[PDB]
């Protein structure tokens, strides 16, 4: 069953994350819609054996990554996406911010999966910047992959939330941040999705990934 | 008369600047309005003697800074601000500034913004930033620096004016001196003497950069 406890200490902390659509009305006016967001503790656990088939397995996959550890850097992130927006013609992007006490060069790998099979992998490397006593790794306007744009358009062409949930059930993202110089895994977020029913918009719940 | 030519080599390059107001409609919906922007050549010149009275003078002032040089890092920036936006009061609004500078050197950079009313400093904002190595050069980015309270109330007062010619008249006595310095050496990397009017263009905010020269 669930095991609820603190993370402890990780070398890298995710502080902010957002996936958005920004549409220009005129050169001085921009409307932004957030699909999901984090950052705008005791954590429960999810057994990794409950999610193996939803993520790429075999060479370089989730079970192999988890076996190499450190296991306290592995999490399952549930998202409740906000698809309530009007798509017209626009920048689909992602923001993120990580922090660490160590100056590192980090590589972020985002793998988009369909039925547990990798369809896209985006790879971005970022050097550290010292700010207010720590090292910060911030990406301001990282473009979404083409697959995501078409997937969002597909979701919005469905009349009801239960239909969007059925499409989202087999869509996952595996986000892995690695120290480029040593190849150590700094953070791994296994992301699952559903549509948000809340009037407060997008929601999320983070769990620790455990094997027992 | 104007002297029109290239800037030459500088240790720091301005790549982007904007002043904005961002308003939350709900936790997932935001609108952003740009008052001014840059980065979204042969430059003409302005006699620095024509602006001495509009900026801070004496110790640390424009004349002293220009004298110390490098003179090719000093510019007059004329802005035509876009004030066509709702004023958001008590509703989750952020009045801010973004900027991005780039260099081949790894430096610690300090940005000093002095707001002047009738040639006299009403606010000085000082912010220090470290470099990030990106795409083969050093990048100095500020994405969400808060505007000073003076600016927020001043923007609110301008917007209430019935005609653009009245906003231009108030703006004749408002200037901003932006000085970017290498924190460790005190060398002036960039100095922008900013003057303002309100835009009449259907394309929104506009700007023109001039090199400051002596004679
Ligand atoms: C190839 C780039 C890409 O797929 N970007 C996505 C990355 C991402 C991450 N890392 C975590 C959570 C969400 C997202 N993104 C995303 C997922 C789902 C939606 C949707 F529910 F609205 F469809 C939008 C965006 C972007
Ligand atoms: C104290 C902080 C502050 O005043 N921020 C301003 C900085 C700035 C700079 N450095 C250059 C150009 C414009 C601005 N800012 C600004 C000036 C004028 C307007 C207005 F015309 F709309 F009134 C808005 C913002 C912000």
Take atom 23 of ligand 2 and give the residue whose Cα is closest.
Answer: B155
What is the distance between the alpha carbons of residues A179 and B62, in angstroms, rounded to a whole number? 46
CB–CB of B27 and A34 under 8 A? yes
Distance B196 CA to ligand 2 centre (A): 9
CA angle B47, B171, B51 (to 5 degrees): 15
Take atom 9 of ligand 2 and give the residue whose Cα is closest.
Answer: B176
B179: which residues sit within 8 A by CB, 6+ positions away?
A: B65, B111, B112, B114, B188, B190, B191, B192
What is the distance between the alpha carbons of residues A32 and A21, in angstroms, rounded to a whole number? 6
Q: Is A68 on the interface with B (CB under 8 A)?
A: no
Q: Please name the helix (run of DSSP H) or strand (run of DSSP E) that holds residue A154, with its range, or none.
A: helix A146-156
Residue A100's region, left for phi above 0, alpha for psi from -120 to 50, else beta, is: beta
Take atom 6 of ligand 1 and give the residue whose Cα is closest.
Answer: A144
Place of tokens 């306290």: A72
3-state secondary structure of A66: helix
Cα end-to-end span (Å), chain B: 9
CA angle B116, B118, B119 (to 5 degrees): 60
3-state secondary structure of A88: coil
At A44, phi and psi to the nearest 5?
-75, 170
CB–CB of B28 and A202 under 8 A? yes
- Evaluate: CB of B155 within 6 angstroms of ligand 2: yes
Take atom 5 of ligand 2 and give the residue whose Cα is closest.
Answer: B147
What DSSP state is assigned to residue A199?
A: T
To test the pocket of ligand 1, the residue of A79, A94, A153, A157 to mutate (highest count of ligand atoms within 8 Å of its CB) is A94
Report domain extents, chain B: 5-213
Distance A176 CA to ligand 1 centre (A): 14
What is the distance between the alpha carbons of residues A135 and A28, in angstroms, rounded to a whole number? 33
Q: Is A195 exposed, middle or buried (0-12, 13-18, 19+ CB in 10 A)?
A: buried
Residue A123 near residue A176 (C-beta atoms within 8 A):
no
Q: Is A133 on the interface with B (CB under 8 A)?
A: no
CB–CB of A82 and B28 under 8 A? yes
3-state secondary structure of A151: helix
Number of H helices, E strands in chain A: 3, 14
- Evaluate: CB of A19 within 6 angstroms of ligand 1: yes
The CATH architecture to which B5-213 belongs is Distorted Sandwich (2.70)
What is the distance between the alpha carbons of residues B146 and B180, in angstroms, rounded to a whole number? 17
Nearest ligand 2 atom to alpha carbon B83: 22
Q: Which two structure tokens, joined as six digits, stand for B83?
A: 């004030």
Strands B206-213 and B45-47 come out as parallel
Residue B113 near residue B69 (C-beta atoms within 8 A):
no
- The fold adopted by the segment(s) A5-40+42-210 is Coagulation Factor XIII; Chain A, domain 1 (2.70.50)
Residue A17 near residue A37 (C-beta atoms within 8 A):
yes
What is the distance between the alpha carbons of residues B214 and B61, in angstroms, rounded to a whole number? 15
């Amino acid at each position: 069953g669930s095991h609820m406890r603190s993370i402890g200490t990780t070398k890298l902390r995710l502080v902010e994350f957002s996936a958005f659509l920004e549409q220009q009305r005129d050169p001085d006016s921009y409307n932004k819609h957030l699909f999901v967001h984090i950052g705008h503790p005791l954590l429960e656990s999810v057994d990794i054996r409950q999610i193996y088939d939803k993520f790429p397995e075999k060479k370089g996959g989730l079970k192999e990554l988890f076996g190499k550890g450190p296991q306290n850097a592995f999490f399952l992130v549930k998202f409740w996406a906000d698809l309530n927006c009007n798509i017209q013609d626009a920048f689909y992007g992602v923001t993120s911010q990580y922090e660490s006490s160590e100056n590192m060069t980090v590589t972020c790998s985002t793998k988009v999966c369909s039925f547990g099979k990798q369809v896209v992998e985006k790879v971005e490397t970022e050097y550290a910047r010292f700010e207010n006593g720590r090292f910060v790794y911030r990406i301001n306007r990282s473009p979404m992959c083409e697959y995501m744009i078409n997937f969002i358009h597909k979701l919005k062409h469905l009349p009801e939330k239960y239909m969007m949930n059925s499409v989202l059930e087999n869509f996952t993202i595996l986000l892995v941040v690695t120290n480029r110089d040593t190849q150590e895994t700094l953070l791994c977020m296994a992301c699952v999705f559903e549509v948000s029913n809340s009037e407060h918009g997008a929601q999320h719940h983070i769990y620790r990934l455990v094997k027992d």
